[model samples]
Target: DSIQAEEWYFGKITRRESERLLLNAENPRGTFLVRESETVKGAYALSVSDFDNAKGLNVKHYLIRKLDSGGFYITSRTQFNSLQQLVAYYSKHADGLCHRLTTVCPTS
Candidate 1:
């Protein structure tokens, strides 16, 4: 139960408090609900239902961005139009791609 302690070490308030704050916070621009993929472990799936008028469109491509980091890490760029399509591709190919990307540097 050191979650609170970890947050303290990071110089942040208790995890409980942060969660409370986030839950109570309002997003004036609207929210993009991202749901965790149940089939693909550690993969994120988008839920645009909360977004404005995101439905009724044929999703044919998707893209993602990464947070700034020095050095390098394994990157995957095969694009798809839908979350399910992307997850399916990764779910099947992650092992092979992961092995092939072993030399892509994890740090600066």
Candidate 2:
């Protein structure tokens, strides 16, 4: 699957922008997006906004790293064939994510 064709796959957006997209004054828990990695070539980052009783609203980021064999994964044990596959898997299960993905951060 072509990740760039997916609205949630926001290629080239900087880390700050992804944070801005996911964080909302109202709730914002589980809002997430994927963007081009600024520090690593050909890799992507997943940004999620979550709320905690002690920490309050906070944003968490995970690198969805690419493999030479053409797979992507946040946790190495769960490799995905495509970004689409990864998103779907995480959407249903929190797994090791800070929270389960509930919303695709709107494109600005």
The count of backbone overlaps in candidate 2 is 0
Q: What would you estimate as the lDDT of candidate 1? A: 0.27
Predicted structure 2: lDDT = 0.87
**Across residues 45-74, which tens digit of lDDT does each residue of candidate 1 receive?**
322111125532211111232223411112
Off by over 4 Å in 1: 1-76, 95-108
* Best-matching candidate per TM-score: 2
Report how far residue 70 has shifted in candidate 2, in Å.
1.3
- Per-structure clash totals for the candidates: 2, 0
Alpha-carbon shift of residue 45 in model 1 (angstroms): 6.4
Candidate 1 steric clashes:
2
How far off is residue 79 in model 1, in Å?
Answer: 0.8
For each candidate, give its TM-score against the true structure.
0.22, 0.92
Writing each residue's lDDT as its tens digit, candidate 2 over 1-108 gives: 577788788889888887777777664688888998999898899999898789888889899999998899998899999989999999998999999988888778
